[PDB]
Amino acid sequence: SFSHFLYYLVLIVVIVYGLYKLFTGHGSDINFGKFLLRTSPYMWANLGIALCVGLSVVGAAWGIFITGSSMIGAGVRAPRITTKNLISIIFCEVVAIYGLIIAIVFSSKLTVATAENMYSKSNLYTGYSLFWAGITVGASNLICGIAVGITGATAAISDAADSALFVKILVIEIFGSILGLLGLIVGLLMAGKASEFQ
Template identity: 40%
Template sequence: MPNLIDECMTWIESIDIVFWGSLGPAFSISLCILGAAWGIWSTGSTLIGACIRKREIWVKNLISILLCEAIAIYGVIETIFLITHIKYQADEEYNLNIRRTMYGYLASGLGTGIGCASAGAAVGILGGYVAISDAWNRHLFIKCFIVEVFAEAIGVMALIVGIVSAASA
């Protein structure tokens, strides 16, 4: 009776290692854009509802949407960084060092994507709360917006960790 773990490892090793390395940029850009889209949707829908109460909060609260768009740009930066480092060497035998590097690129892209997706969701939810609180009391905008900036810092930290881990892979 064959072992399931051995069969899975044989299947993983049978796939070209550059494929696993190329999944890193794919996960990075797709999850970052998904998180940014989720944040824009969450902020935008709440902002439209809050503008019914006070129309003048519209322009001031567009900063939340710009923060969500910045999260998508973090994914593009990580993807460009990873793509420029992936080299396909068809003639050489894949040794353990190349395999470790490609798995590192996969982990780097996946980590950046998950971090930016969660940051996009956090910025979107907080952007909605900033819009609602600004509609009720205009003095709360700056206080709530500072919390939203700290949520954006999650995406910046995910980008930094992704670049550092890809550079050390």
């Protein structure tokens, strides 16, 4: 298709452009180093603070219409379940609160730094750590928000057939929520050492 035809073409320009600069003796000009040393360390940090709360909140709201849209379905013949199956809406939301906490922890570290001590060792580490801490915590919770919603619609059904099936399934949905807690940990160990900008 068209949108799949571009992906074959972007690969081809990068390969022509990767050789023309090489067979002529200019390969060092494509230097990702200077792209990391000269770019402002504030850009890498203000993305990890917006994607953490950005990609996490997409996770929660994703798992809610997979969950709610089926609870409302079963509750046309068995409307008693709306208050017992509410739990699966809580485990979809809590990952958002995991993200909203990190963004406030990292916002404490955003300070003003001089023009001479900007591109120093302690300020490049900070930006690069606050970035891959926002991707990890925003991608883990993005997926935990989907594996809980899916698992939350099966229990919303089985509860409607016979109530004995509900509690036996939360052992799956509780092992689905661990994953959002493990990125919250690892995201901090990165930024446990990083010191605010000087």
